[PDB]
């Protein structure tokens, strides 16, 4: 029956509402009760406020008309307004006070997840105040979650006029009995009710969601903690920079503020950051989520030495040069983690701060060839498997879906053993033809990786492992240095390859190192525990990169 849900902004999706400042201002200032509301509503359908709400005039032009209405109301109530009484002041403060009502947004999100069309229908204004950006940010953050935002001042109609409900219906392509409409103003619900819409009068949020749950039959209250917002690839800004004649890097870009470059691991994608990209943008940063060289829409030349760390890092510096960025924050996971540590040691002037998920910083041992070093740790045997060009490419390319479904697994889900892979003859020799789907991913998300990896396959990616000696010689150049820029290491309890204890000496090289640690988290940290990753990264960004 019900197929659509419509939410007001003031007092429904955002709180405290702004007439709640008309009320509170009267109280705080000991003015005649309702005086500010009288001024606000003066002249009714043709008074200043309606002209505002219909987009006839801007907020800045309205402010002095409200001033005049206040003067008139207080003359007629035979009172004075206090010295320094300021309408601009009151509204600036009310409008910045007003925050997203998180439980109501989460109900709308959930109803949209079960197939509802959702909309915001609000009486609002053209905001040209000096501080208008605050409201622009709120509306951006809210509206991306809905099918439609209908604003009185853009459509030239206002609640409770009946035409705006007809316009709503026509936008929804729904009939009234398929629609629930929530508002904190009863006079605003009446015309929706007249048309036979389900309406809910919102006072406290919980009771409104109780009514909303009853009428839609979906669970909205007491529901588990939802995942952070993810990214839809076709809604992102896609960027492309040529770093040298045969090599272009692709990235996705979202947000404003200090540049934050995310560097994914093997065998992954920009999309491995999908849960971090919207949260970090929301947190005040300019995210650049790379396809690393070898992957996705970035170039993948065939030659092994195109993937040594020296070359990869120089190219990442060029990438900053061509975008006109003097620095970025570098945040890496897995191979990308190893890369950002080398960015910090070789190009500290270009790195505002550095963070790694899982990958520890371990200085090259100048007394042991990296082959031997690798051979001293049974868990790294898969790295020898990767050496011989073509062997791992053929196994990994043979069935892409099976490849990603086998790799991308939570720590409780039959993770592959990295155990005597060479001896066994391959990574999947002991895994099923058709693995089950991890709880971490959807079938759609697996097919995104499959489709990315059909462009270049696994050659470029595997080549990252094929420069052990060359990277060892380059790293030995840095053995006298310390990392003294702001630095964060995030360990994962159940990553059984990049174990938390392998990071234990990092303070000898990075004395002011900060740490986070995520429990019950396997190797695929960003999608295993996206919520915790986001909280640990934002907290460290705000204190150390800002």
Q: How far is the CB of 34 from Mg ion (least distance, A)?
A: 18
Residue 284 near a copy of itself by CB under 8 A: no
Does 291 carry a binding-site annotation? no
Could you say which of ligand S0B, Mg ion, a copy of itself, none residue 254 binds, taking C-beta under 5 to 8 angstroms by partner kind?
A: a copy of itself
User: Residue 90 CB, nearest distance to Mg ion (Å)?
Assistant: 18
234 binds, among ligand S0B, a copy of itself, Mg ion, none (CB under 5 to 8 A by kind): a copy of itself
Distance (Å, rounded) from C-alpha 496 to C-alpha 105? 38
What string of DSSP letters covers 351-395? EEEEEEESPPP----TTS-HHHHHHT-GGGHHHHHTTSTTHHHHH
C-beta separation of 496 from 520 below 8 A:
no
Distance in angstroms (rounded) separating the CA atoms of residues 89 and 87:
5
Beta strands at 4-7 and 179-183: parallel, antiparallel or unpaired: parallel
Among 81, 91, 121, 127, binds a copy of itself (CB under 8 A): 127
Say if CB 492 and CB 518 are below 8 A apart. Answer: yes
Half-sphere exposure of 241 (CA within 13 A, CB side): 20
Q: Does 349 bind a copy of itself (CB under 8 A)?
A: yes
DSSP codes, 300-325: --S-GGGGSHHHHHHHHHHHHHHHT-
Between 7 and 346, name the residue whose CB sits nearer to a copy of itself. 346
CA distance 364 to 357: 20
Rounded Cα gap, residues 525 and 495, in angstroms: 9
Does 334 participate in binding ligand S0B (rule CB under 6 A)? Answer: yes
DSSP tally for the chain: helices H, then strands E: 24, 15
| CA-to-CA dists, residue 237 to 36, 182, 518, angstroms | 45, 33, 31
Q: Which is nearer to ligand S0B, 125 or 408 (CB)?
A: 408
469's tokens: 């000696």
Q: Of the candidates 178, 184, 445, 544, which one interacts with Mg ion according to CB under 5 A?
A: 184
Measured at the alpha carbon of residue 350, what is the angle toward residues 344 and 351, in degrees to the nearest 5? 45
| Comparison of 97 and 374: residue with beta carbon closer to ligand S0B | 374
The residue within the footprint of ligand S0B, chosen from 247, 280, 313, 338 (CB under 6 A), is 338
Q: Which segment (40-48, 103-111, 330-338, 534-542) binds ligand S0B by CB under 6 A?
A: 330-338
Judging by DSSP bridges, how do beta strands 328-333 and 286-290 pair with one another?
unpaired
In angstroms, what is the minimal distance from the CB of 59 to a copy of itself? 9
Site for ligand S0B in 382-441 (CB under 6 A): 382, 407
Q: Pick one of Mg ion, ligand S0B, a copy of itself, none as the site partner of residue 350 (Cβ within 5 to 8 A by kind).
A: a copy of itself
DSSP state of 10: B
String of contacts with a copy of itself for each residue 128-147, x by CB under 8 A: x---xx-xxx-xx--xx---
347 is a catalytic site residue: no
Instruction: Give the one residue of 366, 432, 484, 542 binding a copy of itself; rule: CB under 8 A.
Output: 484
334 binds, among Mg ion, ligand S0B, a copy of itself, none (CB under 5 to 8 A by kind): ligand S0B
For every residue of 382-449, DSSP letters joined together read: HHHHTTSTTHHHHHHHH-HHHHHHHHS--TTS-PPP-SSHHHHTSSSTTS-SSPPPPTT--HHHHHHH
Residue nearer to ligand S0B on the CB measure, 251 or 382: 382
Which does residue 184 bind out of a copy of itself, Mg ion, ligand S0B, none, counting CB within 5 to 8 angstroms by kind?
Answer: Mg ion
Q: What angle do CA 376, 382, 387 make, to 5 degrees?
A: 95
Q: Name which of 51 and 402 has its Cβ closer to a copy of itself.
A: 51
User: How crowded is the C-beta side of 187, counted as CA atoms within 13 Å?
Assistant: 4
**412 catalytic per annotation:** no
Per-residue burial over 464-482, b = 16 or more CB atoms within 10 Å of its CB, e = otherwise: bbbbbebbbebbeebeeee
Q: What residues line the site for Mg ion (CB under 5 A)?
A: 8, 10-11, 184
Q: What residues line the site for ligand S0B (CB under 6 A)?
A: 266, 334-335, 338, 359, 382, 407, 497
Instruction: State the catalytic residues.
Output: 334, 465, 523
Q: What residues line the site for a copy of itself (CB under 8 A)?
A: 51, 55-58, 60-61, 126-128, 132-133, 135-137, 139-140, 143-144, 154, 156, 234-242, 253-256, 259, 278, 281-282, 286-287, 321-327, 346, 348-350, 352, 477-478, 480-485
Binding-site residues sit at: 8, 10, 122-123, 184, 382
């Amino acid at each position: 029956t019900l197929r659509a849900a419509v939410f007001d902004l003031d007092g429904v999706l955002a709180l405290p509402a702004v007439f709640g400042v008309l009320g509170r201002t009267e109280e705080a200032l000991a003015l005649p009760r309702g005086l500010l509301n009288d001024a606000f509503q003066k002249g009714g359908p043709e008074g200043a406020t309606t002209r505002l709400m219909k987009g006839e005039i801007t907020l800045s032009q309205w402010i002095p008309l409200m001033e005049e209405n206040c003067r008139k109301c207080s003359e007629t109530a035979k009172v004075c307004l206090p010295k320094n009484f300021s309408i601009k002041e009151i509204f600036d403060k009310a409008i910045s006070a007003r925050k997203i009502n998180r439980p109501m947004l989460q109900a709308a999100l959930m109803l949209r997840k079960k197939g509802f069309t959702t909309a915001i229908l609000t009486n609002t204004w053209l905001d040209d105040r000096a501080e208008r950006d605050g409201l622009a940010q709120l509306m951006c953050e809210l509206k991306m979650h809905f099918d439609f935002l209908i604003e009185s001042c853009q459509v030239g109609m206002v609640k409770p006029e009946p035409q705006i409900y007809k316009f709503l219906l026509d936008t929804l392509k729904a009939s009234p009995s398929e629609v629930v409409f929530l508002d904190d103003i009863g006079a605003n619900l009446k015309p929706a009710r007249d048309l036979g819409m389900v309406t809910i009068l919102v006072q406290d949020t919980d009771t409104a969601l109780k009514e909303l749950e009853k009428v839609t039959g979906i669970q909205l209250l007491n529901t588990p903690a939802p995942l952070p917002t993810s990214c839809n690839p076709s809604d992102m800004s896609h960027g492309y920079v040529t770093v040298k004649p045969r090599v272009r890097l692709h990235f996705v870009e979202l947000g404003s503020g200090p540049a934050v470059c995310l560097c994914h691991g093997f065998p992954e994608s920009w999309y491995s950051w999908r849960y971090q990209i919207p949260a970090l943008a929301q947190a005040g940063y300019r995210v650049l989520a790379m396809d690393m060289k070898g992957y996705g829409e970035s170039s993948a030349p065939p030659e092994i030495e195109e993937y040594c760390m020296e070359v990869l890092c120089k190219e990442m510096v060029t990438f900053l040069d061509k975008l006109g960025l003097s620095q970025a924050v570098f945040i890496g996971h897995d191979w990308g983690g190893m890369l950002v540590w080398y960015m910090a040691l070789f190009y500290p002037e270009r790195v505002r701060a550095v963070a790694s998920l899982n990958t520890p910083f371990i200085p090259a041992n100048p007394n042991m060839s990296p082959l031997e070093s690798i051979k001293a740790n049974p868990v790294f045997d898969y790295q020898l498997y990767f050496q011989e060009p073509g062997v791992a490419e053929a196994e990994l390319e043979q069935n892409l879906s099976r490849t990603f479904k086998s790799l991308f697994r939570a720590s409780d889900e039959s993770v592959l053993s990295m155990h005597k892979v060479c001896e066994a003859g391959g990574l999947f020799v002991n895994s099923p033809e058709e693995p089950s789907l991890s709880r971490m991913v959807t079938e759609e998300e697996i097919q995104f990786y499959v489709q990315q990896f059909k462009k270049s396959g696994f050659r470029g990616p595997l080549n990252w492992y094929r420069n052990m000696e060359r990277n060892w010689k380059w790293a030995c150049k840095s053995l006298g240095r310390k990392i003294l820029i702001p630095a964060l290491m995030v360990t994962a309890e159940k990553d059984f390859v990049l174990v938390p204890q392998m990071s234990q000496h990092m303070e000898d090289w990075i004395p002011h190192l900060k740490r986070g640690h995520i429990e019950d988290c396997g190797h695929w940290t960003q999608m295993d525990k996206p919520t915790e990753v986001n909280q640990i990264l934002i907290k460290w960004l705000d204190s150390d990169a800002r």
